[PDB]
Amino acid sequence: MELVLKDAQSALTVSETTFGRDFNEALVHQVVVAYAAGARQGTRAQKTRAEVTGSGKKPWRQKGTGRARSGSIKSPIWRSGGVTFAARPQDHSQKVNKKMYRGALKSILSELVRQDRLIVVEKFSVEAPKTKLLAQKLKDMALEDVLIITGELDENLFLAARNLHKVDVRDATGIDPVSLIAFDKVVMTADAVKQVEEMLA
Amino acid sequence: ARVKRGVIARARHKKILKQAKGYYGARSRVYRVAFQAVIKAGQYAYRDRRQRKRQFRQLWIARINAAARQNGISYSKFINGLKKASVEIDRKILADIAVFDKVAFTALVEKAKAALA
Amino acid sequence: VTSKWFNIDNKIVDHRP
Amino acid sequence: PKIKTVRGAAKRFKKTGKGGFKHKHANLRHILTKKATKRKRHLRPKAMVSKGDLGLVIACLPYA
Amino acid sequence: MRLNTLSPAEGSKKAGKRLGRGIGSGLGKTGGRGHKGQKSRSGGGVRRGFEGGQMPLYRRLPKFGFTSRKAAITAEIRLSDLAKVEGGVVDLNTLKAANIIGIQIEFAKVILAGEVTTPVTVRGLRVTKGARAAIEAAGGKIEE
RNA sequence: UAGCGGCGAGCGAACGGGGAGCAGCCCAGAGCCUGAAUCAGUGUGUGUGUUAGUGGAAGCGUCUGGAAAGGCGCGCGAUACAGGGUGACAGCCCCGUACACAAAAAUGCACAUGCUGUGAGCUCGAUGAGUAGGGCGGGACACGUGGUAUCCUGUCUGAAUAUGGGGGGACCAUCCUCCAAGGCUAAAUACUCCUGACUGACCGAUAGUGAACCAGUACCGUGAGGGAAAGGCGAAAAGAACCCCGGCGAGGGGAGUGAAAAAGAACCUGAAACCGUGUACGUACAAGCAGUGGGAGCACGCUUAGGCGUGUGACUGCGUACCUUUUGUAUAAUGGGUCAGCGACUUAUAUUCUGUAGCAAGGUUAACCGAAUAGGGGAGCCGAAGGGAAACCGAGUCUUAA
Ligand SMILES: N[C@@H](Cc1c[nH]c2ccccc12)C(=O)O
Ligand SMILES: [Mg+2]
Ligand SMILES: [Mg+2]
Ligand SMILES: [Mg+2]
Ligand SMILES: [Mg+2]
Ligand SMILES: [Mg+2]
Ligand SMILES: [Mg+2]
Ligand SMILES: [Mg+2]
Ligand SMILES: [Mg+2]
Ligand SMILES: [Mg+2]
Ligand SMILES: [Mg+2]
Ligand SMILES: [Mg+2]
Ligand SMILES: [Mg+2]
Ligand SMILES: [Mg+2]
Ligand SMILES: [Mg+2]
Ligand SMILES: [Mg+2]
Ligand SMILES: [Mg+2]
Ligand SMILES: [Mg+2]
Ligand SMILES: [Mg+2]
Ligand SMILES: [Mg+2]
Ligand SMILES: [Mg+2]
């Protein structure tokens, strides 16, 4: 198929494998879950009975006092004692095969076309790093929540979008599975539509 | 991710102690005692759903036996004569006519006597 | 504290040897 | 960490093509004079580990 | 598709066992360990190959053989691997450069496995009888 | 893995490969020619960081309300919608933020430059002796004395000097490789008492530090040492003028403040055990896990031409708690005074099986690099071929002379 443009009502030729395959929900789920597991920082810890401050003294003698057996005041049964299975810092990142990662992007990318959430242009820039300029441009196109992918990122467009919280602007090398699903619309320049398909082999 | 048990535990305990209304002493106030009481109350209620069927039939038989002997026939011969006469009224209804309509009950005894004789 | 004096005494404790 | 092989088991079993293990027969080291040649002749070739024993061997040799 | 409309494949996410959490769960009060004994204790259980004190199997049976240091530096080559070298000549150096054998291999053999459909020149290798016939059927030659 | 090992429990390499980082020199000495490299110290200059800081955009109408930041309407700023506060939830009220600037004086770097110490280059020569090695005893090597190479030395001895010596896992011969018995040397690497900024599928007052609070305190011990408990009025003290009972009390009742005083200092919320006051029913001739099935009467509501709901429960059938451990417990076997809070199958890394997703005779990368969850990196690992103790042979191979 050929994506229709919006600058000249021309068309761009795209691979059927990249922009026309079926949606593999079970594969894309494993990839957006693996993405979120890699953003976890995993910094926390508690104290076992070994690391709680205290003494190793036995609170009372083993036999004869009429009280339950105790050997330590750091016992996790006691108030202010250790945690039984105290946490350590841990790494929550998973592995994604390269072919499963690239396969999910093609399933995601072709769904955006199928749901006409993908918009292709070759003209998207601003003349000054002004937030009111980009916001007026987006008003004309009828976009409010939008991800803008550019061949190479301009400094004017990067700076004009920082203060708009519904707008993120990215280079073709910086697309990720979760952001394509998050934003309502995706705008690609036809030179970013080029570069994504070679990256997707 | 620490979870506190306070809000859930309170509601689970309050569920048992509401079923223990009317019990004596700690059985309506104290969970360790009200729990065992609500379990045994459900054990009895299950068991006594079978027994309610046994105790009412045993009561209907005694009221038929009493009203039949007032007409000159025992229960064991009254029921046998109703089988030979192909009458199929159950004992729940016979014990109801015995009390409330004693003139219909006499007609049943004559039918039983005619078939048995 | 320590054990009760009758629970320490051998005569009271050791009645069935 | 990596599981450690039972190193004395690896000197006594070799894995075969479909996943069995072969071993040398016992009773052929000494008082051999008093044994029959028919008995000794049958103890020379290697045997296969029986079904009741496979579970013990497989746990001892995790890298076989 | 939204971030709250993705579901996993059915049968991929079996929930784990949670021992000691009640009567109704089926694993309460004992966690599938049965009653008392060595195996029911925390940290209990006997070591690998323990048979009760009876002389275990891997100590009942004799040791046999030795390990050959020559076997580790020897490799097998299949016939389907011969098309994967560059230049149509097969030797030790070309098989290492094709990532077919390891860098420490010194001896190789070509065995009848797979098939060859092109003329290759096998040089300096041992070839089985079956593979020698198969290489020459496709137009190749073997030297030493 | 190869090996070591009461060949048990266990211990466990190297060679070789991929990376991060990379750097070489001096004395054992004379001469020639000099100060020629380099380093160290100091002085000055220049740039840069640190130690205070400066400026920093743009909102009012109306509704509810104790109070507006909220609802509704109409506007504006944005290289600034990080965050915090303000009488409820603020881009435009405040402090900030992005951004742009700032140092009299001291100081860390990096250069340059001045001075002081340093000596660069060539030629010729020398080339670390109670040492290497050995005997005896131990220790280290993955290697437990073994067939045990190599290293270290308490003890007794003891060479050869580049025509010479060491090693190549007992030992010998050949070959290869390197020169002990003198010394110096950056980076990649380990760590955090302490300082700053930022972050969290970390905690939220029995948790998190022992310590959110004047805590290593109170208290305990001769001493070393042990070691607590204890957070929250309100937006703002507006923290209750005055009156009354009382002992010029404690405590209370009014008045007043406040949106709220049943927010009154023992102060947000205010559960349960436990203790009471009031009302409805039952209960002083009646024998037991205290319920359950039936059930009259009474009281209060309903709604009709009636019997329904709620409470109580005379009388009556059946009925010896729960946990645990056991062949077997009402058991006079165990455990629990009760309530509220906490309290036990986890984590990491190897391995096997099952499900599921990808690719498929192939699958997959690790460290690392990286404008960094992308992409590169195929070193490796597993599979497609087995038999034999092994050499070896190979869809076969071992056995055996067959
Ligand atoms: N019966 C005496 C003596 C005593 C003191 N301690 C004891 C211990 C065991 C026996 C007797 C005692 C008492 O109580 O004063
Ligand atoms: Mg703690
Ligand atoms: Mg990668
Ligand atoms: Mg069960
Ligand atoms: Mg038990
Ligand atoms: Mg037992
Ligand atoms: Mg058992
Ligand atoms: Mg200022
Ligand atoms: Mg030697
Ligand atoms: Mg050698
Ligand atoms: Mg609290
Ligand atoms: Mg605390
Ligand atoms: Mg209160
Ligand atoms: Mg009475
Ligand atoms: Mg049993
Ligand atoms: Mg017994
Ligand atoms: Mg019994
Ligand atoms: Mg008891
Ligand atoms: Mg008793
Ligand atoms: Mg007790
Ligand atoms: Mg409790």
Side-chain angles (χ1 to χ4, degrees):
Chain A
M1 79 280 287
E2 280 205 277
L3 307 166
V4 60
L5 266 64
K6 287 208 64 173
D7 301 330
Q9 287 68 32
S10 171
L12 179 56
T13 184
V14 300
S15 187
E16 182 65 26
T17 61
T18 303
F19 286 85
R21 60 185 268 183
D22 63 358
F23 179 43
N24 196 341
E25 182 186 40
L27 170 69
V28 310
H29 182 256
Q30 190 176 354
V31 167
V32 308
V33 164
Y35 194 81
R40 287 184 82 185
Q41 162 177 325
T43 46
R44 60 162 202 169
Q46 286 106 49
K47 312 204 188 295
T48 64
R49 47 180 304 189
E51 298 185 349
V52 178
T53 313
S55 180
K57 184 60 185 142
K58 190 166 168 69
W60 43 87
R61 50 180 293 109
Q62 170 88 351
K63 291 182 91 41
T65 52
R67 260 196 278 195
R69 293 179 299 207
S70 71
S72 176
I73 188 171
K74 320 195 221 160
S75 166
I77 300 191
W78 288 44
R79 171 189 184 271
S80 298
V83 188
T84 317
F85 295 121
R88 304 275 157 260
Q90 45 191 330
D91 180 54
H92 297 296
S93 62
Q94 321 177 355
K95 197 206 173 177
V96 294
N97 293 353
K98 292 177 170 153
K99 285 172 184 171
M100 311 207 303
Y101 178 90
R102 301 204 268 261
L105 282 167
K106 309 183 192 185
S107 294
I108 290 178
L109 276 173
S110 66
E111 270 296 308
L112 303 175
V113 187
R114 203 166 304 126
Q115 296 175 357
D116 63 358
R117 285 160 61 176
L118 181 55
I119 306 161
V120 179
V121 295
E122 182 65 26
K123 297 296 289 183
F124 206 103
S125 195
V126 291
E127 56 276 52
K130 303 297 293 186
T131 304
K132 70 180 165 204
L133 286 187
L134 176 58
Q136 177 60 6
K137 177 186 190 72
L138 296 178
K139 186 180 289 293
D140 293 351
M141 294 177 70
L143 298 167
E144 182 65 26
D145 192 7
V146 61
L147 179 69
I148 304 147
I149 307 167
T150 45
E152 63 273 43
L153 191 46
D154 180 8
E155 302 329 292
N156 297 330
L157 210 53
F158 182 61
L159 292 191
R162 294 172 68 190
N163 202 2
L164 310 169
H165 69 255
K166 267 177 298 306
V167 179
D168 204 342
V169 59
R170 219 80 68 94
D171 63 358
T173 309
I175 72 163
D176 60 318
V178 163
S179 314
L180 294 171
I181 298 170
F183 297 81
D184 295 351
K185 305 282 195 188
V186 187
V187 162
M188 283 184 163
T189 54
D191 68 17
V193 189
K194 204 160 180 178
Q195 293 179 357
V196 289
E197 73 179 356
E198 297 88 8
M199 182 179 72
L200 292 195
Chain B
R2 181 164 182 263
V3 185
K4 291 169 84 185
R5 303 183 272 148
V7 173
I8 297 303
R10 167 184 297 122
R12 174 167 282 250
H13 282 206
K14 214 164 60 154
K15 166 188 60 177
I16 294 301
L17 286 170
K18 177 174 182 172
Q19 289 176 65
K21 275 193 199 311
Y23 295 0
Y24 172 90
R27 294 173 168 253
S28 50
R29 293 158 165 89
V30 161
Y31 178 82
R32 282 186 194 234
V33 181
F35 181 82
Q36 313 186 177
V38 179
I39 300 299
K40 179 70 75 71
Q43 291 191 68
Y44 283 152
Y46 177 87
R47 181 208 67 188
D48 291 325
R49 263 193 301 266
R50 277 80 184 150
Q51 288 190 346
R52 190 196 306 130
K53 297 155 185 48
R54 302 182 212 167
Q55 285 176 40
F56 266 102
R57 162 148 169 157
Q58 162 182 8
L59 169 67
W60 298 326
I61 283 182
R63 292 188 176 173
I64 293 163
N65 202 344
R69 297 195 185 254
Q70 184 178 2
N71 293 265
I73 191 169
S74 66
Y75 165 91
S76 76
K77 300 200 175 183
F78 173 64
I79 291 298
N80 180 40
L82 293 184
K83 308 266 200 55
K84 296 184 178 318
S86 315
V87 179
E88 293 179 353
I89 306 184
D90 63 337
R91 290 149 181 87
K92 179 205 189 185
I93 299 296
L94 284 186
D96 195 57
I97 297 178
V99 174
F100 295 112
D101 203 0
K102 302 173 188 288
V103 174
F105 196 85
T106 300
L108 277 162
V109 179
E110 313 304 326
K111 184 180 289 291
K113 289 193 169 192
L116 183 63
Chain C
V1 288
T2 55
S3 189
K4 282 273 200 182
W5 74 260
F6 55 89
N7 288 324
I8 297 183
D9 187 3
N10 304 257
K11 200 75 155 182
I12 292 183
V13 174
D14 283 13
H15 46 261
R16 197 158 45 230
Chain D
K2 296 158 148 188
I3 306 173
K4 290 216 180 186
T5 290
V6 180
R7 299 295 293 154
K11 295 173 196 181
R12 293 173 163 93
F13 302 102
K14 302 215 194 200
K15 184 190 268 291
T16 51
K18 293 187 286 185
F21 291 83
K22 72 182 168 86
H23 73 87
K24 196 196 185 74
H25 278 300
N27 292 101
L28 207 66
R29 293 297 198 186
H30 56 110
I31 305 93
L32 300 165
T33 298
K34 79 172 49 163
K35 305 191 181 165
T37 315
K38 185 196 181 181
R39 187 178 162 195
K40 295 187 290 204
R41 190 167 65 238
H42 279 87
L43 292 167
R44 260 202 296 280
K46 309 257 183 303
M48 287 263 278
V49 172
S50 82
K51 187 204 162 292
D53 291 331
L54 286 173
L56 300 162
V57 184
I58 291 176
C60 283
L61 296 168
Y63 285 103
Chain E
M1 65 182 179
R2 303 287 173 171
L3 280 176
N4 59 346
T5 61
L6 305 167
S7 296
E10 69 275 16
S12 44
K13 298 310 195 80
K14 193 174 213 55
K17 283 177 160 187
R18 270 177 69 227
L19 309 191
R21 296 302 185 269
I23 279 174
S25 82
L27 287 154
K29 167 195 176 189
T30 308
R33 284 179 185 247
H35 284 104
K36 330 184 296 198
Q38 182 161 21
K39 255 186 287 185
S40 172
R41 313 297 186 186
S42 159
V46 288
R47 67 163 193 275
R48 280 177 313 180
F50 193 69
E51 297 195 2
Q54 179 187 7
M55 197 66 57
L57 190 62
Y58 64 88
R59 268 160 61 55
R60 213 189 287 176
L61 306 171
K63 309 186 286 173
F64 66 93
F66 70 92
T67 307
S68 180
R69 320 188 44 242
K70 201 162 180 171
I73 64 179
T74 301
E76 274 160 340
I77 308 296
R78 292 166 165 66
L79 293 168
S80 74
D81 295 21
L82 297 176
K84 283 160 179 176
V85 298
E86 302 79 1
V89 176
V90 167
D91 62 358
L92 289 176
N93 289 340
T94 315
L95 288 169
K96 293 174 174 168
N99 200 29
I100 288 188
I101 49 174
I103 203 63
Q104 183 62 255
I105 307 295
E106 293 166 40
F107 313 100
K109 277 197 73 152
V110 191
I111 67 171
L112 184 70
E115 65 183 1
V116 56
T117 62
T118 61
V120 299
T121 301
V122 189
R123 179 169 290 161
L125 269 53
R126 292 184 302 235
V127 187
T128 67
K129 277 74 70 178
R132 169 177 302 262
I135 293 169
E136 295 173 341
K141 64 179 272 215
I142 305 161
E143 293 179 353
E144 186 64 33

